[PDB]
């Protein structure tokens, strides 16, 4: 049994980024991993001693989930040359990996693109509304992605978006979503938490895309799907590397083309979801894998 510790930036009950690592880690138990998870460690002064403690106790693999945990991972890695570490970040992380650290990245714009593409693939949805949080560069990039994905799959659809200015302000998110609904949105896309948007959607009988998996049953019932990271192949590769003695300096991109970004199991909502939605997304992924389709940089 390989002993694995996951050190998460936020809360694994978020039904989103941190839950994605927790779910991959749960599935990794079938590959012979014994897993411990610690949450809420975005603060590097808190993360570094926890990481050190797992390494000192003889864990085989210590995984820092989220860019905020990356620097502590890289620092402690230098102390334990025979322990294996993982960190996440931007493309520049590849440069900065000690011999015993694997790194990974993904592009926010691609999550947006898949949401928008799914939105444009639906039946009878000509008006789409999206609600995000603060207008930070990665959020604006995500939204530029949505617009592009939607234009690709349905160039006739119209699109409006609203920003709450905040992370995880469900009350403002709900209000923003209701405003788009009142103006005529036939689908609501969440780029932040989504639980507030989900409430507004239920009140107006419209489907959603992107809402947190931690939402209640009534809200989950209207969420067609959500674009997410599948970390399981990456984690499986870590175990294989450790078993073969080849761990270190791998740099993985999780993307649509390689199924690092995928959909959650699709829910049919109303009659807007085509029977072949998954096939359409699979074909999109194949076009990206081949380079038939190339996506712009969605950042300014
Ligand atoms: Br986080
Ligand atoms: Br969850
Ligand atoms: Br994310
Ligand atoms: Br376990
Ligand atoms: Br354990
Ligand atoms: Br433990
Ligand atoms: Br914890
Ligand atoms: Br320390
Ligand atoms: Br983070
Ligand atoms: Br990250
Ligand atoms: Br060591
Ligand atoms: Br991007
Ligand atoms: Br940013
Ligand atoms: Br566009
Ligand atoms: Br707009
Ligand atoms: Br706005
Ligand atoms: Br803002
Ligand atoms: Br709130
Ligand atoms: Br509402
Ligand atoms: Br909820
Ligand atoms: Br190794
Ligand atoms: Br790609």
Q: What domains are defined for the chain?
A: 1-107+229-265 (3.40.50.2300), 108-227+266-300 (3.40.50.2300)
Residue 82, SS3 per DSSP:
coil
Dist. CA 160 → ligand 16 center (Å): 9
Contact, 145 vs 109, CB < 8 A?
A: yes
Residues with CB under 5 A from ligand 3 (ion): 17
User: What is the rounded CA–CA span in Å between residue 99 and residue 85?
Assistant: 10
What per-residue string of b and e applies to 82-105 under the rule 16 or more CB within 10 Å gives b? ebbbbbbbeeebbeebbebbbbbb
Contact, 232 vs 27, CB < 8 A?
A: yes
**Placement of tokens 């015993």 in the chain:** 100
Residue 88, SS3 per DSSP:
strand
Residues with CB under 5 A from ligand 9 (ion): 9, 66-68
Beta strand pairing status for 251-254 and 101-106? parallel
What Cα–Cα distance (Å) separates residue 137 from each residue in 128, 148, 209?
A: 22, 16, 21
User: What is the rounded CA–CA span in Å between residue 232 and residue 20?
Assistant: 9
- The contacts of residue 195 (CB under 8 Å, 6+ apart) are 170, 173, 211, 212, 214, 215, 219
Dist. CA 168 → ligand 18 center (Å): 6
Dist. CA 186 → ligand 13 center (Å): 30
Segments in the chain forming alpha helices (H)? 17-28, 44-56, 70-77, 108-120, 137-153, 170-182, 195-204, 217-220, 232-244, 277-290
Edge-to-edge, what's the strand order for the sheet holding 223-225? 158-163, 127-132, 188-190, 208-209, 223-225
Dist. CA 2 → ligand 5 center (Å): 9
Q: Which ligand is nearest to the CA of 11?
A: 1
Dist. CA 35 → ligand 6 center (Å): 8
State the helix-helix crossing angle for 44-56 and 70-77, rounded to 10 degrees: 40
Contact, 254 vs 260, CB < 8 A?
A: yes
Dihedral pair phi/psi, residue 289, rounded to 5°: -60, -40
Q: Which ligand is nearest to the CA of 205?
A: 19
């Amino acid at each position: 049994a390989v002993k694995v510790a996951i050190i998460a930036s936020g809360q694994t009950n978020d039904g989103a980024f941190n839950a994605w690592a927790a779910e991959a880690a749960e599935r990794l138990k079938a590959d012979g991993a014994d897993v411990q998870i610690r949450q809420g460690l975005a603060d590097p002064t808190q993360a570094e001693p926890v990481i050190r403690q797992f390494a000192a106790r003889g864990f085989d693999l210590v995984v820092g989930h989220g860019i905020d945990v990356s620097e502590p991972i890289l620092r402690v890695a230098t102390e334990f040359p025979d322990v294996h570490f993982s960190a996440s970040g931007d493309a520049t992380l590849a440069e900065r990996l000690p011999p015993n650290v694997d790194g990974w990245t993904y592009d926010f714009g691609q999550l947006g693109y898949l949401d928008g593409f799914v939105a444009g693939s639906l039946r009878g949805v000509e008006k789409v509304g999206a609600v995000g949080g603060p207008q930070l560069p990665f959020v604006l990039a995500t939204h530029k992605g949505i617009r592009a994905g939607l234009k690709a799959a349905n160039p006739r659809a119209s699109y409006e978006e609203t920003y709450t200015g905040r992370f995880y302000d469900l009350q403002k998110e709900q209000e923003a979503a209701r405003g788009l609904l009142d103006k005529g949105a036939q689908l609501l896309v969440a780029t932040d938490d989504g639980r507030g948007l989900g409430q507004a959607a239920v009140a107006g009988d419209v489907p959603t895309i992107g809402v947190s998996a931690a939402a209640g049953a009534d809200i989950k019932a209207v969420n067609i799907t959500t674009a997410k990271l599948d970390l399981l192949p990456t984690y499986q590769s870590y175990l294989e590397q450790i078993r073969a003695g080849t761990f270190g300096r791998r740099f993985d991109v999780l993307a649509l083309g390689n199924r690092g970004i995928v959909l959650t199991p699709i829910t049919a909502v109303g009659d807007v979801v085509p029977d072949d939605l998954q096939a359409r997304v699979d074909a999109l992924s194949e076009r990206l894998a081949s380079g038939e389709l190339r996506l712009p940089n969605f950042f300014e």
